[PDB]
Amino acid sequence: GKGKPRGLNSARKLRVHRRNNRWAENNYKKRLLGTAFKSSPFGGSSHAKGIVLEKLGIESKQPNSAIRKCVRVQLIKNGKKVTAFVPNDGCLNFVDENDEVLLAGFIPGVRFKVVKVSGVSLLALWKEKKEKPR
Amino acid sequence: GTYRKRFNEKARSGHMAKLKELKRIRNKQFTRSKVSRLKKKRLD
Amino acid sequence: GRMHSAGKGISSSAIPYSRNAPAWFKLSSESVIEQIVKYARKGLTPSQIGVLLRDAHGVTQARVITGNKIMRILKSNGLAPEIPEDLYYLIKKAVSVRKHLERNRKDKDAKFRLILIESRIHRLARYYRTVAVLPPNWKYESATASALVN
Amino acid sequence: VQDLLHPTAASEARKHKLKTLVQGPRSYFLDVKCPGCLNITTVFSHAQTAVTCESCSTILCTPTGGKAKLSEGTSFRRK
Amino acid sequence: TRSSVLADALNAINNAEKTGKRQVLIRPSSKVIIKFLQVMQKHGYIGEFEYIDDHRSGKIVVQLNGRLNKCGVISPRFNVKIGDIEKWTANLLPARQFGYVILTTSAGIMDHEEARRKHVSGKILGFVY
RNA sequence: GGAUAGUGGCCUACCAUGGUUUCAACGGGUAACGGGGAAUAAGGGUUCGAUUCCGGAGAGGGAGCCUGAGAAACGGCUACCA
RNA sequence: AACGGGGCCUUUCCUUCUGGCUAACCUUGAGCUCUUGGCGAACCAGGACUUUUACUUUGAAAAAAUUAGAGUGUUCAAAGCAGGCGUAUUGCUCGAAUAUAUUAGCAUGGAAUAAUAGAAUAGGACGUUUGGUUCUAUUUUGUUGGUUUCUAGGACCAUCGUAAUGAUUAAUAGGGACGGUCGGGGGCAUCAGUAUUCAAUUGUCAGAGGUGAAAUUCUUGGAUUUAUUGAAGACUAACUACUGCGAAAGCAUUUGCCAAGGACGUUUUCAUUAAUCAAGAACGAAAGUUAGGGGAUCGAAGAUGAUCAGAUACCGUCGUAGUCUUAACCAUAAACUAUGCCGACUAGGGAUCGGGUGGUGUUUUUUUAAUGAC
RNA sequence: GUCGACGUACUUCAUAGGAUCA
Ligand SMILES: [Mg+2]
Ligand SMILES: [Mg+2]
Ligand SMILES: [Mg+2]
Ligand SMILES: [Mg+2]
Ligand SMILES: [Mg+2]
Ligand SMILES: [Mg+2]
Ligand SMILES: [Mg+2]
Ligand SMILES: [Mg+2]
Ligand SMILES: [Mg+2]
Ligand SMILES: [Mg+2]
Ligand SMILES: [Mg+2]
Ligand SMILES: [Mg+2]
Ligand SMILES: [Mg+2]
Ligand SMILES: [Mg+2]
Ligand SMILES: [Mg+2]
Ligand SMILES: [Mg+2]
Ligand SMILES: [Mg+2]
Ligand SMILES: [Mg+2]
Ligand SMILES: [Mg+2]
Ligand SMILES: [Zn+2]
Numbered sequence A: 001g002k003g004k005p006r007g008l009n010s011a012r013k014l015r016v017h018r019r020n021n022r023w024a025e026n027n028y029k030k031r032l033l034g035t036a037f038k039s040s041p042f043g044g045s046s047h048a049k050g051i052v053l054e055k056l057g058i059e060s061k062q063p064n065s066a067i068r069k070c071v072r073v074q075l076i077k078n079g080k081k082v083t084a085f086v087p088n089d090g091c092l093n094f095v096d097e098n099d100e101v102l103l104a105g106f107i108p109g110v111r112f113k114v115v116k117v118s119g120v121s122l123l124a125l126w127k128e129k130k131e132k133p134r
Numbered sequence B: 001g002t003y004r005k006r007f008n009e010k011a012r013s014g015h016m017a018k019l020k021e022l023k024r025i026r027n028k029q030f031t032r033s034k035v036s037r038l039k040k041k042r043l044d
Numbered sequence C: 001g002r003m004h005s006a007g008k009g010i011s012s013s014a015i016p017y018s019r020n021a022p023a024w025f026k027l028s029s030e031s032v033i034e035q036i037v038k039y040a041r042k043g044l045t046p047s048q049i050g051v052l053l054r055d056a057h058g059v060t061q062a063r064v065i066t067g068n069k070i071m072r073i074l075k076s077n078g079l080a081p082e083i084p085e086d087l088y089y090l091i092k093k094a095v096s097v098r099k100h101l102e103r104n105r106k107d108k109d110a111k112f113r114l115i116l117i118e119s120r121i122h123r124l125a126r127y128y129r130t131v132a133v134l135p136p137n138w139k140y141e142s143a144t145a146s147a148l149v150n
Numbered sequence D: 001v002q003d004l005l006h007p008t009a010a011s012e013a014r015k016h017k018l019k020t021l022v023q024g025p026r027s028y029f030l031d032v033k034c035p036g037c038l039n040i041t042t043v044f045s046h047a048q049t050a051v052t053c054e055s056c057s058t059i060l061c062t063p064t065g066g067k068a069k070l071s072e073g074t075s076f077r078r079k
Numbered sequence E: 001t002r003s004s005v006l007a008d009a010l011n012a013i014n015n016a017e018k019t020g021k022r023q024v025l026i027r028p029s030s031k032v033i034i035k036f037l038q039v040m041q042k043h044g045y046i047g048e049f050e051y052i053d054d055h056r057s058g059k060i061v062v063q064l065n066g067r068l069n070k071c072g073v074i075s076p077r078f079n080v081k082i083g084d085i086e087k088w089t090a091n092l093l094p095a096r097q098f099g100y101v102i103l104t105t106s107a108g109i110m111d112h113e114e115a116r117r118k119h120v121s122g123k124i125l126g127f128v129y
Numbered sequence F: 001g002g003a004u005a006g007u008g009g010c011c012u013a014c015c016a017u018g019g020u021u022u023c024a025a026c027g028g029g030u031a032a033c034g035g036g037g038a039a040u041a042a043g044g045g046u047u048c049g050a051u052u053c054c055g056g057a058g059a060g061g062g063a064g065c066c067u068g069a070g071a072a073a074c075g076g077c078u079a080c081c082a
Numbered sequence G: 001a002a003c004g005g006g007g008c009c010u011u012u013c014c015u016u017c018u019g020g021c022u023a024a025c026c027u028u029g030a031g032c033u034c035u036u037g038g039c040g041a042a043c044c045a046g047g048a049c050u051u052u053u054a055c056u057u058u059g060a061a062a063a064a065a066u067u068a069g070a071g072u073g074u075u076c077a078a079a080g081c082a083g084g085c086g087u088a089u090u091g092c093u094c095g096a097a098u099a100u101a102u103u104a105g106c107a108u109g110g111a112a113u114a115a116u117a118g119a120a121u122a123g124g125a126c127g128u129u130u131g132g133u134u135c136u137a138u139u140u141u142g143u144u145g146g147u148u149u150c151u152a153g154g155a156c157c158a159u160c161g162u163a164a165u166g167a168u169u170a171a172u173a174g175g176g177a178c179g180g181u182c183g184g185g186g187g188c189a190u191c192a193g194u195a196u197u198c199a200a201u202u203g204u205c206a207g208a209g210g211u212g213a214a215a216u217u218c219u220u221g222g223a224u225u226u227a228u229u230g231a232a233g234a235c236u237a238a239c240u241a242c243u244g245c246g247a248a249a250g251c252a253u254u255u256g257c258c259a260a261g262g263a264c265g266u267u268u269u270c271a272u273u274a275a276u277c278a279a280g281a282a283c284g285a286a287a288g289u290u291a292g293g294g295g296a297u298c299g300a301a302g303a304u305g306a307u308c309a310g311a312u313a314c315c316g317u318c319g320u321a322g323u324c325u326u327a328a329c330c331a332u333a334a335a336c337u338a339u340g341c342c343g344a345c346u347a348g349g350g351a352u353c354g355g356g357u358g359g360u361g362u363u364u365u366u367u368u369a370a371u372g373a374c
Numbered sequence H: 001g002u003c004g005a006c007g008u009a010c011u012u013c014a015u016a017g018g019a020u021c022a
Helices: A011-022 A026-033 A122-126 B010-026 B034-043 C029-042 C046-057 C062-066 C070-076 C085-103 C108-131 C145-149 D009-014 E005-019 E031-042 E085-092 E112-118
Strands: A047-054 A070-075 A081-085 A100-105 A112-117 D029-033 D040-044 D075-078 E023-026 E049-052 E059-063 E071-073 E100-105 E108-111 E122-128
Touching (some): A081 A100, C029 C070, C085 C145, E005 E023, E005 E071, E031 E049, E031 E108, E085 E100, E100 E112
Antiparallel strands (some): D029 D040, E023 E059, E049 E059
């Protein structure tokens, strides 16, 4: 015996035993209880809006440094402050204080990158195909 | 689904009434904000 | 093998292959039956009758000699225990244990053995009720079990 | 090497009663002659009862752990 | 307590084959055991076998020729439809034509190829290969 | 007995004390209309199905009706709630 | 020659009634075929009669669309169910297939596997036995109604006869009984052993105690040590061994009482009564709580001497609760083989514990012997 | 109140072994 019922009329015990045990999985528990988005960086969203507080690396001497591309952003949904990357210092000119920025998942500790500023794509601005509306 | 929060409960008051009645019959066997609750506890 | 224990003993009686009476046995099949009835009238249980016949009369097995089991021979002749023999002895043992417990309330060991004996009565009493040997409303109740064993 | 279908007689004799090819009793019955009345009584080899001669009421055997011990002075034959 | 005597018989045969014994003792006997052994005998996996009567369930002595790779019982005896036989042959046998899956069908106990030829089906008793 | 197109505690009067449940009743949750179907998978399985067809229910929320073969209708009526 | 499917025979046919047709069999006659007249099997239809399922085979059912899939030059294809062939003229013609679909319900062939019921106070089966007490009622009663007769049928009660008259093993499953044992298994009484502490008496006289050295401590009112006693409360050394017993925790002085138990022996008895187990219950080391008793030793807590020296570095003295017990709570352990329970099988060896069998073995019984021990 | 316990979500530390050669 393998420690499980094997009789032909033991379907109920096998079903009930299985149902009780599926709750041991973390994947199952999160999936059913709807808590799988607590771990998500944006709390269930794929993108987040934020307010540019300050450009921390604006003053760093070495051009195009990793620090130069970081911007300190305040998440509008909950007000928590986070750090986000910019593709390059050339794009950092477009970003300035007090604009709405759409963040996306990505110096360790920086997990976000800016994809839109003032409702316009940075890549569109970087390629000189749009103007930032103010 | 029976007693879930509705967008505008006031606009369907009669509906809410039914639910209450149902509860009173269904749960008859048993009967026979964070800040507010914490404030009461600390006051006590 | 033992229920209510860890023992696995196999001591048992081995019935011979041949199902006919021994050649050296030269007593009529009838005459054995009166012997069974006479002992049953004397009060002996079926187990005790078989020991006497086998030990002192050469009756190897009542079924072989007479074609019917001892209990059936007794019932045919109007001799029938009110309750089956084995159930009678289990109740008798439990009554003796209870009489020991009332004087000795700290005898936790006897308290444990009483549960095993009673749980043995209920399993056996449950069997007889199914076959209808025992009336369906028959229960082993602790208080009045002394009456049944008498 | 041995043949299970046709075991040796000594081999079977050594084995336990229930473990032979076809289980059977290792006991037997005896004709015991009372010293007084010279009548014959049938006694089981492993008798559990103090068999008594019916005419003389004399003890013929006494029970023990296994085989019964026959009373001294009682002649016996295997039946 | 003894639940499946056929399981005990098949296990004893497998152990005896493993140890290289030329013959094995099976106790208790049964009609199902005898029919299973007769199927194996027809397919050659075992030799002559002899039933010993002792006024009880009985005994058997089986001659072994060393041609048996494995014999086993499938417990519980699942109800097998004609479509479901091939699944069982795939699951239990190392190859397609290496071995047999024995079924107790309404026409008797038989190997799966005989079942397909006779267009019958039933419960599954075990396998031999 | 009443009522219904009609069976029926559907309701009434009088009677009994019954009925369901560890083979999970009852209560709770459901980001629960159900199915045909969709995806994946070697097979067992797991998940999805408001959404071209079928059936059910609703016409802001409760309640009650006229007409008519057919509606408790709402691109019909009356009251109450918002 | 292998594979499958049907029939018979072999002690093996469902029973009964009615109806329909009629084979074959006997026979006349005319040529294996027709024909006269009997007999009417088989088969079919219906009424009574009737153990119930599980399982599997086959057939219907499971909308269309969707999926798979046959045909077709939508210019190809995704698709769609279209289309194709002649043509001066009137026209001809192939398709719109097929499979799948779980469970439940229905019909059907199997009869392996697994259940279920039957004859035991016979209240049993059968009948061309024989009698009753009942109910029903076709036709003939011209017709209707009522009664009666005969008759038929159903049920019931007796009677007679027929019959192989009716009960599967007894699992190296389980329970029960019996016999002689076995155990540091359990409860209640009882007996003893020194030892520890204390007290009395007793002889002696400077230390005793503890440290790495000291000091708190006791001490000429006699300490420590010595001898004769006495009291109290615990615990059972050596024998003592992973050996024995118990479900586990656990169990060690003698004797008695009470009940319980494994194994062994049995040609005794019952006959599947069994394995595992949510719910529920009994016990559960040590510590611990409630209320009495006891309180020798050791001793959490508390106090106090010294706080110098690293192998002897946490030591000393007093010691509350506890340790013990009675009546109840608590329910935890490395509660360990860090290893579920039941059953089967797969090597040799010699040691040990309990029982049993065998020996013409040693010893004892010192009369034999029989026991006991080897 | 840089409070305790729990639940949840994360971060981090433990990877080299044999043979030849210099
Ligand atoms: Mg196994
Ligand atoms: Mg026994
Ligand atoms: Mg009423
Ligand atoms: Mg859904
Ligand atoms: Mg909904
Ligand atoms: Mg839908
Ligand atoms: Mg509507
Ligand atoms: Mg609206
Ligand atoms: Mg309306
Ligand atoms: Mg509208
Ligand atoms: Mg409308
Ligand atoms: Mg079906
Ligand atoms: Mg037996
Ligand atoms: Mg011992
Ligand atoms: Mg016993
Ligand atoms: Mg308790
Ligand atoms: Mg106290
Ligand atoms: Mg322990
Ligand atoms: Mg085992
Ligand atoms: Zn005599």
